[PDB]
Amino acid sequence: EEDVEKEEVIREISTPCLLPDFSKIKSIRVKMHGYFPLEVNFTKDYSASDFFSGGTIIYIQRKSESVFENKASFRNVEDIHVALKRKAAESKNYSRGNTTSSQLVESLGIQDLTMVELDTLLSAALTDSESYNLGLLCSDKNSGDILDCQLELWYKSFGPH
Amino acid sequence: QITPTRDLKVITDELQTLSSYIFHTNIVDDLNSLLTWMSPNDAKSNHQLRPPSLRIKNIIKVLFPGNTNKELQLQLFSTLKEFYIFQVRYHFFLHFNNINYLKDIQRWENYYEFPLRYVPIFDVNVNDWALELNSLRHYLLNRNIKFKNNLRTRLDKLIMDDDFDLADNLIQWLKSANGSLSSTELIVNALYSKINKFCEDNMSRVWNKRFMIMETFNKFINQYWSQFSKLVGCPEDDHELTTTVFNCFESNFLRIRTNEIFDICVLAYPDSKVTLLELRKIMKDFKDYTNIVTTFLSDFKKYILNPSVTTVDALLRYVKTIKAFLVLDPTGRCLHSITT
Secondary structure (H helix, E strand, O other): OOOOOOOOOOOOOOOOOOOOOHHHOOEEEEOOOOOOOEEEEOOOOOOHHHHOOOOOOOOOOOOOOOOOOOOOOOOOOOOHHHHHHHHHHHHHHHHOOOOOHHHHHHHHOOOOHHHHHHHHHHOOOOOHHHHHHHHHHHOOOOOOOHHHHHHHHHHHHHOOO | OOOOOOOHHHHHHHHHHHHHHHHOOOOHHHHHHHHHHHOOOOOOOOOOOOOOOHHHHHHHHHHOOOHHHHHHHHHHHHHHHHHHHHHHHHHHHHOHHHOOOHHHHHHHHHHHHHHHHHOOOOOOOOOHHHHHHHHHHHHHHHHOHHHHHHHHHHHHHHHHOOOHHHHHHHHHHHHHHOOOOOHHHHHHHHHHHHHHHHHHHHOOOOOOOOOHHHHHHHHHHHHHHHHHHHHHOOOOOOHHHHHHHHHHHHHHHHHHHHHHHHHHHHOOOOOOHHHHHHHHHHOOOHHHHHHHHHHHHHHHHHHOOOOOOOHHHHHHHHHHHHHHHHHHOOOOHHHHHHHO
């Protein structure tokens, strides 16, 4: 509240910083490249003092860098700068390869969960009740590697055998 | 990107019936000659990278010189498109396991699009031909691990030998494919490998120069930054990318100096004094100091602490390291660790 009756001013501070009095704070958010954003707004019902009564520390969850997350398409923006920073950070530990399990699952060629699952399911048949269910997956309103399933179904239906 | 297919037999039967009704002539045999020519399934009746005769071209002119004829003609195009769509993927699936290099997919693309110039079927305003091409590219990326690895190696080799134009074509191909190997990761790794090798080539064992990291960074920027920006497509004045590149350069400079610190302090001193002071500007963490000492002890004890070495030269080199590290470290805590 800027210590006055004015509306608001955004204040950007580092982490180990002394925030102002709890009763005068309306909302706080944390944003940073990596851990997914967290934002809490304090209404009249609960105050910042009541929220922090258990402790003055708030935890944030870690966003997972999983191969299964990026099945076929990268939904992440993947900025060139943060990719370079991550590469430099990884090299610092490396200076201080197929060593991690993510490369192992990548080497096995089972990265795509849905594509592998439908490949097993289509192995033989093609019962009509199932076929409509598989066709429903191809005709999904929103999904990921939809084009992969469509062409896999085409390969099964009218491919070499 | 949903594409329909109505089986080869049905679409062929629809095609012969439509041509017979519209044309009222015996072009069906001659129509069958065209479909084989566009067909890469049969390698005897297709083009085989050979221009068609006058017969095929004349027919196309006939096919390509009221409302019912227009819609009957329109559904014909769609039916011809469906026939070719069946025909390309079946050929692609026949040779799916035979793909190992990018040059293979380009020649197959030329093989498929060879009839395209002689018979225009794809409308200009709809990039339909590109859509299935990206679809087939996407599947090849997401189904053939060996092709994916070969593309990684090919791009790494191409970026290593400064074949920038072919590398740009490869990056464009990957972006169009939109596969599980995004070009952003590849250019990051290619850039990281290139800067590491350039650093190894340039600032290896050269310690007389002052502010040489600036000299190295400027030389690399003038030699490769414009090409790299063209590859990525980002503006040339990307300030934060240049800052990160510089931060990686000094990190590489630190790593090289940590590796060579023994010859740096023992032999070149005091000629390498200047870069020692520059090194002092970079070291900031306790891990950096513990790595610098444990390496330096390891080599010094390896070489100098041999009793086969003369004791007078051993002491002379020893005090040379003492003054070198004292100038490097005003506190002298590392000297105490070395002395103990």
